[PDB]
Symmetry: D3
Subunit: 232 residues, 6 copies
């Protein structure tokens, strides 16, 4: 039928950092969300690709994500390439996502911007019939950006107060990334990173009058219907 | 008991220009919307206070607005004054609006910014029990700005595609403002102004994938719940 | 002698959407303007490349454009490539345009930003003698951006009130793009798009005290001489 | 009959810093430019009202400005007051300027923003017939801001390459301001200030491909006609 | 003789929220920091002027602040008034601060912007000899803004990793503000506010590679000398 | 041991224009700074590559720069390429710079933005152990941008009042670039350019209360410790 949400990350844990709470919130309401990791994060200082993929599976189940893909594009190699756009178009056209999410570009990790750029190009081409005509076109309704590193004034927020614990659980599934363990090394991700993610969501929460909120960017104004006065 | 929306303008027609479509959309759904105009637009180039008051009633009727107030503050005199803030605080506390709207400040007409500034101060003070303790306090949930003159990248939009006709009717209620008539003088408001308002809403509409949308500003991030996936 | 204006678009109709009114205004005053379409818009949902080229010719004549080129670069393929910059440099050096226009980058169609980026690179290289020394260098005086999709606060406007009908005519020349016809499909361009373009120009018009104005972006402050107090 | 340009400053030398070059350029072409300083700069660290008034006359002469007014509002007292707005409205309606200039608000000296704010309110009210109905209204065509302290990405520039010398002469007319002399104290204005003003204009110049340019801000998009292709 | 830092707030706890960590960091190094609260927060939902004054003393003690003043201006009455500017000018000239801090204007509480605006006007006038000539003038070196409500991309940060505990202690001194207690009502300040303040500082910290950092705004570019390479 | 500062430019003279005063200020204090020019500026209208390299050496000695490298990437060819990132990573890992500087992207010369983009990518990859594992990783502490063409509100300034003459000397070392001579041609660099650079620094100086200051951009807030209240 088609995914309600397809969220792209450069590396498994990107989507979790940006929007694990939102995903958990909406999968619980019965919406179908998929995650597509562009790379296997082979250059990550800690862990292995297989371990990372296993953690991605654990995280997916925590978030109620039934569909998780890895396009196996090179870590630190998300250049603006036709072949990569093609691969993402294939994903978009296969899963027909109503909404697509990708990282926000203003991020210390260039892969995140590069992922967003590829996804943006792919979203546009996905709706073009004559492009890759072997697959039926799909028009994504909206493209939004979640935040990985740092913070920005969000265009919109999703209240994740009831789902923060699940987000932390989803994040903690990436043991290799955010914890040293027995043979791991100290990285920015190991040293108070998950705490920083919680902090951001607390900060965004306060902005909108809730305990924890995830913040999102949108190139277009968000369309309000039921959320203006509530009632759903 | 309280209004769902209270929309402030400096002059009658302000709220209409900014959000007649949204107001009509929501009153049709059974929501209670009030309008409070800060002034009687005593200095308007065309028309009189008399004619404007009647037009404001016609516009309110068109929009399904049952409550329209005018604070009769001086046109072009919306200075940051305690007396004016307290009058607006009285209004907010009386009508207990969930949402308050006011003009966006980036506007060629200084009254519009001045109105927004007064309303913002009043919203904050309205929630403060110790302030004007004779009148029970009220906490407004959200404060949004609509656009009168010009345009800005909206923080959010309301699809008014079905209500554009009603918006135009509500605007046209101000015949003294938007038409020269036979005795009136040419103003920015008579020279393709209503057409410009429709044009803006068309532009905002296209941006969000609808025919016509009204654009709004919000200092805080918009909180989505049902509107993310509909 | 050299073009007064060379306007680039990614697709034929880009320049029209952004600045058909301005072009018509200035060709009528006897200025020479050319248009260079980077692609043949082969991936356009409606029409054919030949039909599109014929519509581009009709549009050009409506606007009083005597020079129209198509570089036949791939639709959805305006990557930052040396070969493409080279081709545009060749165009700039051949036609010696005083002003160059291209799409503004803040646009839902990535080709538009990509076109602008290529043109910007080419403009700079066009003025470098040692670059492609087989063609004499040319220094473009100013590079401005017109708007295709959406809207932005313009850095400057051109009053096109007297030329709006001609702009609409130029736009309507692209029957395949903005009208369904007998065998066309519904796209964002077919559903109230031309009306939206008029709306934008009405909006920009009001900003500057005229009926219809086209809005432009400029990286540098515009230099005023005669337009400060008028009189020409 | 009306001025082509009326330039407001908070203090005499403001307009010179912002736009002496532009003023000189246009007065030489036969355009009528007036300057109105809101205050007599009564609190200036160096000089006196007496000396400053004379310097302002010398500067006006250098710039070819035939009309210079001073409203003698309080230095550091340019509050948003009705009385001050109406005094400025009187000036605008008397001199009927096509263009009005005032300082840009993003400036370390609060009087400059305060001046601009007052002037903006006055420009709007100047066009309103019912406001101060004893004096015929005037509609200003465009309102632009010049820069005094610091710098900003200009919305537009005026090539003043031929008039930099005149600008420097006009600035140097304020010897009490830009030089310590023999009894004066060190201020931001004495410590390489004129050199900084020239520096800015050099920077703006380079940006637009000329030797020296003055930079201006405009809330509305600049309307080009002849200057697109020259 | 003069203070190194004078930090202004509209209400006691403002300075703490913005910069208790920085203040503690620098007082521990032997720098003299003063705090001036413009109002006694007479309209605060919870507590009394009495309790708040005592809490402000406890907070000052925690931060190593030896000088705390209160100007007892009206809560929610921080209008741009000459009388208020001059009171603040008196404070600046008396205590001769090298640096002055005030709230950042982009803040849901209008008093915070209003405080900053008053302080900015006062800083400028404090340096003007002819203004209030009975009291020797003082030139403040730099004016910075700290953040109370919300967050902004800071122009600069101060590493407060070692002083977060002291900041929390200083905030917790305002038990009447940040806890409902047993008789108090729920406010934005009682609902995970201190946790939000810590959260912000964690966020700013991460941005600059430390555990906790306080963020500051500066209208002028930050001048680096020793901190470029440490 | 490792450089305190490594400054990248696209062309020799870039670093000088942006930060010759700062470099001179800090080399005089005994800090070690290196410069890496990405290209030999082979497309420069005046001079030759060898002459340019000789001027770069003269400029380096004026600034007290003991290390100057040229990566010999193509002028007007600083595309986002893996090979170029690799080369810069090698430089960063070899010289272990505490701070890295590159041009600010908002610049009429696209090479400057392109240089900054390459350097940003390289800085990130330089800290990744598994990337190019033959060289030990290096974490650059901070990345800042200097300004070449035009001007921007600086995030921070360095007082160069005492070192302006040295900056002018460093700039004047590029005789081929900023002076016509006997067989040179008129370019934007020859016509009041060095004067414009001084002007900018005078402008930035006034902003921070000094005679001359260089202005820098930083993606992160600058961390103040000693510079808040002085004393070092
Ligand atoms: Zn990642
Ligand atoms: Zn109005
Ligand atoms: Zn196109
Ligand atoms: Zn002044
Ligand atoms: Zn407060
Ligand atoms: Zn260069």
């Amino acid at each position: 039928s088609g995914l309600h949400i397809l969220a792209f990350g450069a590396h498994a844990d990107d989507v979790e950092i940006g929007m694990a709470g939102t995903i958990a919130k909406y999968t619980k309401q019965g919406y179908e969300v998929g995650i597509c990791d562009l790379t296997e994060a082979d250059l990550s200082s800690n862990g292995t690709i297989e371990l990372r993929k296993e953690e991605a599976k654990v995280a997916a189940r925590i978030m109620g994500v039934k569909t998780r893909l890895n396009l196996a594009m090179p870590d630190r190699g998300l250049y603006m390439k036709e072949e990569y756009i093609r691969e993402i178009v294939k994903v978009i056209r296969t899963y027909k996502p109503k909404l697509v999410f990708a990282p926000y570009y203003e991020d210390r990790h260039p892969d995140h911007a590069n992922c967003a750029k590829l996804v943006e190009e792919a979203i546009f081409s996905a709706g073009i019939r004559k492009y890759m005509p072997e697959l039926s076109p799909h028009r994504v309704e909206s493209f939004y950006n979640y935040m990985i590193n740092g913070f920005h004034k969000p265009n919109f927020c999703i209240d994740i107060s009831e789902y923060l614990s699940i987000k932390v659980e989803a994040l903690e599934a990436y043991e290799s990334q955010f914890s040293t363990g027995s043979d791991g090394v100290k990285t920015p991700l190991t040293e108070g990173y998950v705490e920083t993610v919680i902090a951001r969501e607390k900060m965004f929460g306060k902005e909108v009058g809730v305990l924890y909120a995830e913040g999102f960017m949108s190139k277009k104004p968000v369309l309000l219907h039921a959320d203006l006065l509530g009632g759903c």
